[PDB]
């Protein structure tokens, strides 16, 4: 037919029972929304909700990758500019435009280089959207609570060592110099929690 199977006449075609009770979800995903823009949840580019996602958290650093416009950004010509700066600082009796010529050559090339890198990077955005991005559909991996289950596995271990007792328990922090300020008969180092 003339358009997508996941999108009917009035908006996104409502499959699950959540869509029938909440059918704002069909026609509005945000302020970057158009009607052709339903079912493709990502909107155009340079546009609101255009950002691709990686394991659910959106990719907002793209330029920083190819080293265009970043603090860590790749610099094309250094040796030139340093050489020329040295020339300027040394003396005023002789003026070297030879250095400024090597440099302006370098720059003249740099322009085209950069346009190339930018173009290749936009191709990367396209590829990343096709073959990698989940389009914001999977749970965040990037903050510690998302990994809670992992930490649980560790707490469990420290519990089975303790005879399956103290869960989430840790040793009492003692003092800066607990070991040498305490008399014979008192614990000088922090014990296992079950051992208290």
């Amino acid at each position: 037919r003339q358009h997508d199977s996941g999108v009917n006449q009035y908006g996104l075609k409502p499959t699950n029972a959540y869509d029938y009770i909440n059918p704002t979800n069909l026609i509005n995903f945000g302020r970057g929304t158009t009607f052709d823009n339903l079912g493709v949840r990502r909107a155009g580019r340079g546009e609101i909700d255009s950002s691709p996602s990686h394991s659910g958290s959106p990719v907002f650093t793209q330029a920083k990758l190819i080293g265009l416009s970043g603090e860590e950004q790749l610099t094309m010509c250094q040796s030139e500019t340093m050489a020329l700066r040295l020339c300027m600082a040394k003396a005023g009796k002789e003026t070297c435009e030879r250095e400024s010529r090597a440099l302006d050559s370098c720059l003249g090339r740099v322009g085209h280089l950069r346009r190339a890198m930018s173009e290749a990077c936009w191709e990367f955005n396209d590829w990343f959207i096709q073959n990698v991005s989940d389009n914001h559909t999977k749970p965040f991996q990037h903050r510690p609570h998302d990994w809670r289950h992992f930490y649980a596995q560790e707490k469990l271990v420290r519990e089975r060592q303790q005879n399956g007792h103290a869960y989430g328990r840790r040793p009492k922090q003692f003092s800066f110099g607990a070991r040498y300020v305490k008399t014979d008969g008192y614990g000088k180092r922090p014990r296992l929690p079950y051992n208290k």
Binding site: S55, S57, L65, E71, A120, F124, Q141, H142, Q173
Partner: protein, 184 residues
């Protein structure tokens, strides 16, 4: 009162306050000195300093030291912050690998383009375009070209930028190198 060396109030200058330890020559800092650099003759110490500082900053040591040396934080917030840092790292790594796996494809398409240039103009011609000395009659020409390459390859000292430290009001983070808000 007694303060540690990385404490705010550590070395005070007041009518009561007096600095602690042997302070010169063989000193209080004897085996406590994290870095040592013999200054190379005719080298400004500004390159030395910016090298040290770039090093510390990129490996996130100055981060750590600034962080822990200002305020106390419970072992839970320390864990939360460090593991958050490390998981954000993990995520961005898995992004970098994707980028790179693409850029090797781009680089391939480039090398392929270069091959097509080869069989349009012939291999030797392309080599000529790339600076092959086929015009070098005698060794003196060769030594001119290689003297050029020598004067390129010699590395002028890199002055690597160190992000300034931002002093905010009550200092929620003294790791602050930018004005962005952070989750404490």
């Amino acid at each position: 009162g007694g303060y540690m060396m990385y404490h705010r109030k550590a070395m005070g200058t007041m009518k009561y306050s007096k600095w602690k330890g042997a302070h010169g020559g063989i000193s209080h800092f004897y085996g406590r000195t994290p870095m040592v650099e013999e200054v190379r003759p005719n080298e400004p110490i500004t390159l030395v300093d910016r090298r040290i500082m770039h090093y510390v900053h990129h490996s996130r040591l100055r981060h750590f030291q600034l962080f822990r040396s200002y305020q106390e934080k419970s072992n839970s917030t320390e864990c939360k912050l460090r593991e958050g840092e490390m998981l954000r790292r993990r995520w961005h790594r898995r992004l970098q690998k994707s980028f790179i796996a693409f850029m090797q494809f781009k680089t391939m398409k480039v090398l392929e383009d270069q091959a097509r240039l080869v069989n349009t103009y012939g291999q030797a011609a392309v080599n000529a375009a790339l600076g092959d000395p086929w015009n070098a009659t005698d060794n003196v020409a060769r030594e001119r070209k290689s003297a050029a390459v020598r004067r390129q390859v010699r590395a002028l000292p890199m002055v690597n930028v160190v992000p300034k430290h931002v002093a905010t009001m009550k200092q929620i983070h003294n790791d602050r190198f930018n004005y962005r808000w952070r989750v404490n």
